[model samples]
Target chain A: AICSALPTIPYHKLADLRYLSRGASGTVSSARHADWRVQVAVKHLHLDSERKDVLREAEILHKARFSYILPILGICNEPEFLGIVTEYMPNGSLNELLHRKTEYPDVAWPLRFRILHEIALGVNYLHNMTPPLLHHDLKTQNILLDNEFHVKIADFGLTIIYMPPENYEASIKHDIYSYAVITWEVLSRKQPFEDVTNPLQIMYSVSQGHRPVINEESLPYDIPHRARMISLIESGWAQNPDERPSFLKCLIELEPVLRTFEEITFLEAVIQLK
Target chain B: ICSALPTIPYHKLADLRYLSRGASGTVSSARHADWRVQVAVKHLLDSERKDVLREAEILHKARFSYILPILGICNEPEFLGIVTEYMPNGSLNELLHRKTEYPDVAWPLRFRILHEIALGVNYLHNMTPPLLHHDLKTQNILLDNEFHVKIADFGLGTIIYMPPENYEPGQKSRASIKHDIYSYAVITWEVLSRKQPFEDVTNPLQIMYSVSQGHRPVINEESLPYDIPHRARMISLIESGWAQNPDERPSFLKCLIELEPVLRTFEEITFLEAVIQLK
Candidate 1:
């Protein structure tokens, strides 16, 4: 049985490709689709037969769509401009919210914990799919946040942020490692080895044995469910990747922790934080 | 907030890499082709234009070591920014707390850093008309290429570093010279212990509640360790530095005097060895 092909939106319909942000992850821009008349985000690729290849990869994003995953609007696959357009996230990425204190004054524990739980839920859905989609490339930047501070898994496309890591994607090994970084980022609100800014330096040190700090300072004593959160984060980024817990296992562990705080609590925290 | 600010042309600022957005402003890493170096550009709002330019003036005031250097200011009619030296080493907070990469930060290096910070702060307080620095903390203390202290945020406001007297909202308190001393005391504790203050406190409200109640970060045999060099003297200095009354706190000059002897014990070679080993 064959599935329906994803519709390729006309390049003319897409308005100005305004520059948004750039990193090792390649360039991203926001645009308005003339047809939809809504602000849309695009992950610019640096594409025809390229079209065939791009569409094939993007098909999974369409089929395996969930609440936590970024919705795939359509593809613009011209030789001049090739991109994957998705719904724009007003709150930006998880990395921004965590570090940029001015944009969000205070990111309370309840919201942070909820972000952790929801990320697992999203990943679990991906893993449980028929072919079992594996997001080999995962990081805080790839994690977009909605206006309400909800998680949206992004950048599972051809133009993925060029991340250097080891193999073993079949069993969620690499994802767990990346997930650990996100977890640490969410908990500590800091970049790993942020002081050691050199990319090669990080690879050299980390290739041997370098992990983000997990201590009284980094995780801190005040973090709710500190012991378990630290334990899971440690295990996730452990040297033995395969030894890490499953996404489902993570959900199971985090579910109870998340339940301690009510929805109203997160809502009120969001209210004042704005 | 002067109109006659050092204006950097937007054209010269090339390859703008978006970093993050803030309160009515946005930050990006850009390459200043003319300067032949990477620079951090903070695009600010109209109101922030005044605040941003004011920060630039502060940078121009006392140009010295252990202070973040200002690159230039981009003051377009619509787009405004404060470009500064893009520090790759991040801040003192990262170097101290991130134990995995920095597992064994030698005492000599920490002492040297603390000594340098005191020098940095003293310079500020000693300035003509005295730049209060209003904000001083581990996070604000940026590190240069050599991992040396580079005190920053000469203009912004933050609560973590603010003294307890100013914490109980509604009552407006005049920022004093002693405020920096209190924060420096807290920063010193973090540097020595490699742990944050009130590690158990949840929010700003709790921090205010506890710090106002005469509670400070613990300093004893375990946290400070009995075996540390000049631990007793340093502890006493820290205690006096964060004394409840603003006037009771020691001046930066006093802190420098107390620390010079301790710093004199550590040789220059120790820091060299430290720089290599840490790498």
Candidate 2:
């Protein structure tokens, strides 16, 4: 009954299994679900020594379906390969959108702010679930964009760039911290602690009260809702977990900032994407 | 040198300007960085990088009249981009649909384009091992400065272009050549009508549902309103090409055989006439 909640697709049913990308959690691929007749993403899960309850994962995905959250279509529960199926995002991840300079010449402020707001809205939904699901891994790569460039937050909590301090338990606050880093990233288009180079040194520096730069050059004073953005970003990534506001609180602040921009502004930004 | 590998450094391309984004990667317009004139650069990331070489190799091998020519391949340790000759007029979708730039397209030119696309595809179908142009649409059809058809993105996927069988259950294994015919059928309607295949239906499911149910792009006078010569035959071909039953659809070869007379009867659009009509 539990597995039946989401269709348990036989592995053989997936046609044209093209390898798209891989990450800490698993290797992501695109496959044609013959029955559904739609392109679907299959994350062939990477497992540790501990065997996973893939049905439980599916159940969580089943419950946590939201507009901003990437919808889980089905699951592949083959004995040899456990895979989580999701709607294949056409525009690709926010990481590619922001960083791939050649791809997106001008992702205007409205779209950038829209992207940030959508991510906040996405994570808030996860936090508000009946039992309260934590998106423990929050990477830009996990922040998928549909063909229309709308946010479709994928993957359960996981990652390096968006990783919060190790001391914090699997808490909602960790996401807020990651959100702060992502916010700074949206503002800067530069990875957090990107210059540090060494992974151990980067974390060590971040551990010792080092966050991404929050100045005119990095965040830029010219940005709309400037002071307020900095204030929330600082509070969100505070050394003390308690200091960070809930995702709802973050949404409350972001709503007005995003509201100032018109629909045409975002629409115009999207047209330029072509 | 015709068989020479196109593999080269990525840096050779200079003045890299962003053109468009697609299934593989961002397509940028860059100079050969060698005073070798303009070229299109489609960069692929590490994971899907191999597809670049395959497509690049195909492009090199596909030296023909209408197929877009491949110049070289940008291959480095962790990066890849396939370079091809830049088509100045972009896609037929833009030429036909974008009303602002092209308020009205000449029927003769449109007829010529359709003819060339059929001929180009026929060549691909005739190729040894047969390059099934998995996807074909108005968007995939590129026009040069002369508005001559240079069919782009030979190896690809597009839901709108795929036939009904591809959508049907228990029919997944066979990737048929007739599938391209189904696409050509729609492109035929698109070329004739100068309107989208299923413009009336806003929803995607509506399109898929309609296509699978043996309903086609409404082949009536309202959709094909004109006193054009041999109109019945073209309409007849569109119906036959997009027939829901794959067996009924004509091959690209059959498409060429049908289109030749209509294209020839239409004004013999000269090279200068094509460019002059653009204004």
Candidate 3:
């Protein structure tokens, strides 16, 4: 079995851990590999405390490996330390960089657009999985970065295994809805329904087809391709999920926009301004 | 480079025991099934998955002698796990707050921990992106069995400790290095006093109110040795660090400069004696 081939690491080999943050089911921390002399991210699962023979996440990650997806290292299935291990990203997340622009003021339109394209590419790959993995929780926060700030879609804990469902389209639709929200977030650097404090209210409005407000003032005015990008955001967030563009269609629309601008020049200009 | 982070399979971990629970998630002590050594596993919530991973990224960037090292990330369906080196001696909070257990903690040991903390935060500040460790509380400082300091919870772990008043609506968007200096000041007070910042206040809001009103924990001459050679200079440093004006708070390098003179007076044998005396 593929799960049987998974490597088990000695707990002592993981050294010098610093507590990172907590999630609902597990705690995440960064640690050093004693022999490897490198940094890694460790996810210890609380639910797995009583469970045994559970390597489902490891198998899913191994099978879903792609350039755009963050790869899993291995798992620790001991009763106490039941968890999976993965590579540590140095640049943090899209949410952190976009919201804290002071930390990365040089991220211009070209880089933003590239991130959008990369996210789409990653989702497109997920939709093509054997049973077709549906990422129900795709958001800017889940989009991670490497040393150079390249996008890597992460946090597949919420991924729904669609297993050839009768309504395959519905599964794909859920991802499209998330993709639209992410698109809005990447472009505007704002959360969907930022004004709504209540979670239920946000859900109500989103269900009512009350998409994020597209204030013209927030969009980039000087960019020649601004209108095109805005159009994509609009189309992606169309009230009817069926009307939303497929990942392939989204890619086709974006590749041209990516090629239209001299990204290096724009990035260099952005750097100079800083 | 091989130094880049890699994923490990689930079977790699063997002996596991529950460690402790925190505001974030539960921690467990475990051993590699193959290598047969101990490690700490941090379990995170689904909501905190991204934020914790972002911490992992920051730790990766701020790798230095003073910062706690991250080993690998465990991405499972139930939880987000971070594997790190297990410090047998626990945290600085444990060492200070539980004075009965660590009684007679000599000045040299305390001075070394403070000096190393400054070195760690200074390295973070000098990074290319200038990582800010907004939370620099005593609880976040870990100590090795040998009493060396490794600063933990730099970015995300520390955010939970931020007072509501500091996060003004629009003002919260920017990352300020000053927030860390403020935290460092509070930590210095805790270390010197060997007590919680607001020992009398039952409510966190009360502590915040007191801090906002410019009321710092009173320095106790009785707790810290009265005849300590560098007592006056140490008092001056702590006072300056806790200055009401954020700008008045000294930089970590400046803090280091002030700390050097106090540390320099101790000879190697004296420092060794202090370490031997520690329980």
Candidate 4:
């Protein structure tokens, strides 16, 4: 285990605790463990989750073992409770990083690109495994970060997979297209889809071949992989399923493209060697 | 060509044919092939899409080797600016079909089920070759007269092998069980994630990063690989996907497991199994 042992659950003993952050759906509270000289973050799942969804959350976290995936030192849930014991992240989330008043200017573009790339890779691995997968719901609110500004992807309940359906010919294709839409959201840092306010409008515009407007200045400078990323989505989300790339194919394609883009942009930076 | 000799661009032909369907992005009509006894459906790409997107109707007809995909005739666009193709029958108008205002579905539930199964297999097959061989065409077999459906996958893309990603010299292997494993994984993840794996992605690069390395899924470990035998069994079934060789991936078992729900089977059993094995 990456974390130490516990009887009932971890983090129950910490006394110097305080509320760190809260959202409409969840909350993050902080506590100090003087005995271990450490800080912890407690993420409580929303109060309204069904029993089955709660079990699914535990399922996702159990298999989770990645650097950016926040580790749960413990879990506390019952007939109607759900919480995760985690290492306290001092910096907070991307939303806080961007929207909150901070002494530091908003994360510089370079650092932003790096964090974005890290989060993408984490989600990619989850979605591209043997079963095609997805993060059903994603937004700036769900992202969490550490003191060094490294990002961790949380909230597995929103993850989805593009499993082939018995009757839906367009299932995988639709998933790929949806990925493109989400990708657009990340880059533009906006919530608008095809400039529409509601699903009815967005759906209507899409059927008319409308796509998110491309912003030339917003193009990521530090990441060469951005172009390949755009092309992948354009190919995958082209209104029709036949045109989209599969999750596995998209990842494999992104590999060389990422390397090439890195070499072109980073030149001799040692960080690229990894 | 799977379709008969090419037909003329929409505008070049006489205006005798009336437009049968027109929507925001596409327009379809039944054109009487000059002097030919049979009539064909011709769907034209809207002028608005000339520079922005490819002709979806053409892409579907030409590339998808399935009943769900439409059939292509010849390009009417670029010359007179419109695509031409065969027509479907007993179908609701285009907007109506898209709207699901069905007098009856063009495809019954069972046949649609079968077609989806075939597509699952075809997806794996199509990507096995050179990723760039753009000239490929696929075909499928279907049922008629008596409503029995038997899908045949044909006209596979050329094995360019790229002399890079792969080589035809190796002679591509036949379908295996890994397809089943992968498909199972996708289906299960879809239900739980509630998000589309790919399209729903907002920033391609960001998502690419998260999925490949960053975000770890919330997979329940206890009931997943060990506690749940049903899930464990299917995951075991798809174990071949773990093989390093891309060629050694498993064949899709969709056909075999088609009756799972009827057996009162739970999704987690199959999906958890696939996720455990694949992970």
Assess chain B of each prediction and give its TM-score: 0.90, 0.92, 0.88, 0.35
lDDT of each: 0.71, 0.74, 0.66, 0.41
Q: What is candidate 3's CAPRI-style docking category based on DockQ?
A: incorrect
TM-score of chain B of 3: 0.88
Docking class of 1: incorrect
Candidate 2 residue-wise lDDT, A1-274, digit = tens? 0011455678987899999988445678999765334468887765543236455556666566555777676778777778888778888888888899898877799999989988987888677655678987787877888755789887664346567766533666888988888888887887777677678776777778788888777877788778988898899889888989988788878878886986557656766776
What TM-score against the true fold does each predicted structure earn? 0.48, 0.52, 0.48, 0.38
**Where is model 4 more than 4 Å wrong at Cα?**
A1-7, A23-25, A33-36, A45-52, A77-82, A95-113, A128-134, A158-179, A189-200, A215-227, A253-274, B1-279
- Regions of model 1 farther than 4 Å from truth: A1-274, B1-6, B20-24, B169-172
- Model 1 lDDT tens row, A43-121: 7655347556656556656665555788666777776777777778877888788999887778888888878776776
lDDT of 3 by residue, B1-279 (tens): 113344444567667678788437777878644222357777755567777677666765565557876656677675567777677778888888786787877777778777788878887786665777766777778886457888987776332234333646245433666666667766766676676666677776676667767777677775555876577887787778767776676777777767777878876455445545664
Could you say which candidate leads in lDDT?
2
Candidate 1 has what TM-score? Answer: 0.48
Q: What is the interface RMSD of candidate 4, in Å?
A: 27.8
CA lDDT of A42 in candidate 3? 79
- In Å, residue A18's CA in model 4 sits off its true spot by 2.5
Backbone clash count, each prediction separately: 1, 5, 60, 80
After superposition, which runs of candidate 2 have C-alpha atoms over 4 Å from their true positions?
A1-4, A46-53, A157-161, A166-169, B1-219, B226-279
How much of the real interface does each model capture, measured as fnat? Answer: 0.00, 0.00, 0.00, 0.00
iRMS for model 1? 28.5
Tens-digit lDDT track of model 2 for B1-279: 012533557877788899888556889888653323467888854446667767777766554547886656777786678877788788888988888888768778878788888878876776666777867888879886457888877865446777877775344425577778888888888878877778888888888887777677777788798665578888888888888787888877666766666766754324234446564
Best model per TM-score? 2
